[PDB]
């Protein structure tokens, strides 16, 4: 139903090479709308093409067809890949990183302590 995302609260912040935004999203007689579609629409407003339009905010408000969000739009992909905060890249993931799930590693690290120095020895035990 035409949507029309028009975005409040602009900040030109060149210290993280990013226009950091609030997104006010209309879909006023339906609701919702996928982040991927939000990037696509927003991309062709600032000319920065969609896989940089890093938008994490969001609450579908009260009873209809508004979501107030935040978008972050990063000038170069190179700067995007540097400030990251890593997990944000991974959601839209060309970046997929390693579940541990962490308490397995802790048990191994405790085993590593016990025996004098070596430490490669008990990588192998682990």
């Amino acid at each position: 139903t035409t949507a029309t995302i028009r975005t409040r609260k602009f900040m030109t912040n060149r210290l993280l090479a990013r226009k950091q935004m609030v997104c006010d999203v209309l879909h006023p007689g339906l609701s919702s709308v996928n982040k991927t579609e939000i990037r696509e629409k927003l991309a062709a407003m600032y000319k920065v093409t969609p896989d940089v339009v890093f938008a994490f905010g969001f609450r579908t408000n009260f009873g209809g067809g508004r979501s107030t969000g935040f978008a972050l739009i990063y000038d170069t992909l190179d700067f995007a890949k540097k400030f990251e905060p890593k997990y944000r890249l991974a959601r839209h993931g060309l970046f997929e990183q390693k579940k541990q799930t962490r308490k397995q590693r802790k048990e191994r690290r405790n085993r590593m302590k016990k025996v004098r120095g070596t430490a490669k020895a008990k990588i192998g035990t682990g």
Binding site: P28, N61, F62, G63, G64, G65, R66
Partner: peptide, 10 residues
Amino acid sequence: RHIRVRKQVV
């Protein structure tokens, strides 16, 4: 949940 205060179902 049948009333709207402007845009919001309340």
